[PDB]
Amino acid sequence: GSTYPPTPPNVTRLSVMLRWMVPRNDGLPIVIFKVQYRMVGNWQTTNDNIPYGKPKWNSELGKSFTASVTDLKPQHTYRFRILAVYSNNDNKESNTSAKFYLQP
C-alpha cells in the first residue's frame, strides 16, 4: 500500500512545539507518529507515541497535529522530523524541519 508522508513539523518556542500535517490522501491509514530530533551537524527518537486518533481530517487540507517535546538541552540548534507508522507496519519519515535554536 501507499504511504503518504506527513509534512515536516513547524517548530516554535514554548520546550518545543511541533505542528505537522497529514495531507488528505487515499493511501494507508496511520496508526501512530514518533518524534525524532538531532542537533545540527545522529537522530534520536523520543518516548512519545502519538495516536492518529479521530477525526480523520480537521480541515479541507488534511489533519493537523500539535505536540511538544521536553527536556532538550538549550543553547543548541536542532532539527526535527515526524515518523509515521502505517496500518501495514511500514513507516515513513517526514522531510526534516528547518533548524531551530533552543533559547535558554
Swiss-Prot record:
Superkingdom, taxonomy of origin: Eukaryota
UniProt subcellular location: Membrane
Binding residue positions for heparin: 38, 79
Span of domain Fibronectin type-III: 5-104
Glycan-bearing residues: 10, 95
Description of the deletion phenotype: Patterning defects characteristic of Hh signaling loss in embryos and imaginal disks.
Function: Mediates response to the active Hedgehog (Hh) protein signal in embryos, functioning upstream or at the level of patched (ptc).
Domain notes: The first Fibronectin type-III domain mediates a specific interaction with Hh protein, in vitro. The second Fibronectin type-III domain is additionally required for in vivo signaling activity.
Similarity remark: Belongs to the immunoglobulin superfamily. IHOG family.
Subunit structure: Homodimer. Heterotetramer; 2 iHog chains bind 2 hh chains when facilitated by heparin, heparin is required to promote high-affinity interactions between hh and iHog.
Name used for this protein in its record: Interference hedgehog
Lineage, highest ranks first: Eukaryota, Metazoa, Ecdysozoa, Arthropoda, Hexapoda
Span within the parent record: 466 to 572 of 886
